[PDB]
Design a protein around this ligand. Structure first.
Ligand SMILES: [Ca+2]
Ligand SMILES: [Ca+2]
Length: 314
DNA sequence: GGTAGACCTGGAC
DNA sequence: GTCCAGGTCTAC
């Protein structure tokens, strides 16, 4: 059928697959795990969302990642469009190689890795990543997903509509820094986060040099990027790390939240050594992050995703 | 120089 | 009706 969300069976000629074994990527373990909040399983095993300013539907078989895009005449995705999908999932980074290494240096990682293959990091857009995680503060994933959706619906550009779903592109800096946005976001249920959304948008455009400043961070060292990000209102060590890890190419960045503290204590009998406190605090979180980096290496941020993801399913 | 309390809310024991 | 989720900010 020419309407609604497509499926592999429904409209064969509209799909193109990317070679990708299930071992290298599990959509069901990556898309809804708190990295990106804009993907939905509209129909069993099919995930739809905005990717590179267009709407897509993804679904995988044992060895392939099937992709279909909605733009004027319907047709299978082009190589360039697909190249964008390969880049979004950073498929050049071999998960099997990382799993092997982590497992080799962490008997526990190896035990959990057995049942949670295919967990990797998406390479996201800095702006979408920054505001989505500014909303992550003291918040659960489902609720975060709700705010972000309402936000994009209210300030994002309309793309296309499938069934009763109107997909929007993520809002721009200009739109987010616009007048009365805070109040509007409060009516959308963002709470105090509404202020930070507004404040960081203006801070970027009016004090840091705009979009480029943010994008430039992809060429800056992890320490540099993390330092710079914390300048923005509503951005702490936690959010700063999520952004470094998920959108600024800093794979050693490790977000330290309650989940990771629980993992640290329950699975490694970890405890602060250079800190006064016995629990989460600026000093102890920095220490935990260093512990995980020292344990997993340059891609500690990725290893962190595998466990964080497994800890949600539980 | 580290820490307790304010800031918002839909859903859960 | 408290308790809780990928925290951050700032007054002692
Ligand atoms: Ca929390
Ligand atoms: Ca900050």
């Amino acid at each position: 059928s020419e309407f609604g969300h497509r499926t592999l069976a429904s409209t064969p000629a509209l799909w193109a697959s990317i070679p990708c074994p299930r071992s290298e990527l599990r959509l069901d373990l990556v898309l809804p795990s708190g990295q990106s909040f804009r993907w939905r399983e509209q129909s069993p095993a099919h995930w739809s969302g905005v990717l590179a300013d267009q709407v897509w539907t993804l679904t995988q078989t044992e060895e392939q990642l099937h992709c279909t895009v909605y733009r004027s005449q319907a047709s299978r995705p082009t190589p360039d469009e697909l190249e964008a999908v390969r880049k979004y999932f950073q498929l050049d980074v071999t998960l099997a190689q990382l799993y092997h290494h982590w497992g080799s240096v962490d008997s526990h990682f190896q035990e959990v890795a057995q049942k949670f293959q295919g967990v990797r990091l998406l390479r996201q857009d800095p702006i979408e990543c920054l505001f989505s995680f500014i909303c992550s503060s003291c918040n659960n994933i489902a609720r975060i997903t709700g705010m972000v959706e309402r936000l994009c619906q209210a300030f994002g550009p309309r793309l296309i509509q499938l069934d009763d779903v109107t997909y929007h592109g993520f809002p721009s800096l200009q739109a987010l820094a616009g007048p009365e946005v805070e109040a509007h976001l409060r009516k959308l249920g963002l709470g105090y986060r509404a202020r930070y959304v507004s404040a960081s948008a203006r801070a970027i455009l009016e004090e840091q040099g705009g979009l480029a400043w943010l994008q430039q961070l992809r060429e800056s060292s992890y320490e540099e990027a993390h330092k710079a990000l914390c300048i923005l209102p509503g951005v702490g060590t936690q959010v700063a790390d999520c952004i470094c890890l998920m959108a600024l190419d800093k794979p050693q960045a490790v977000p330290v939240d309650v989940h990771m503290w629980h993992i640290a204590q329950r699975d490694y009998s970890w405890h602060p050594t250079t800190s006064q406190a016995k629990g989460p605090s600026p000093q102890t979180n920095k220490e935990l992050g260093n512990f995980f980096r020292s344990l997993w290496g340059p891609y500690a941020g990725w290893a962190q995703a595998v466990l964080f993801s497994a800890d949600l399913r539980q």
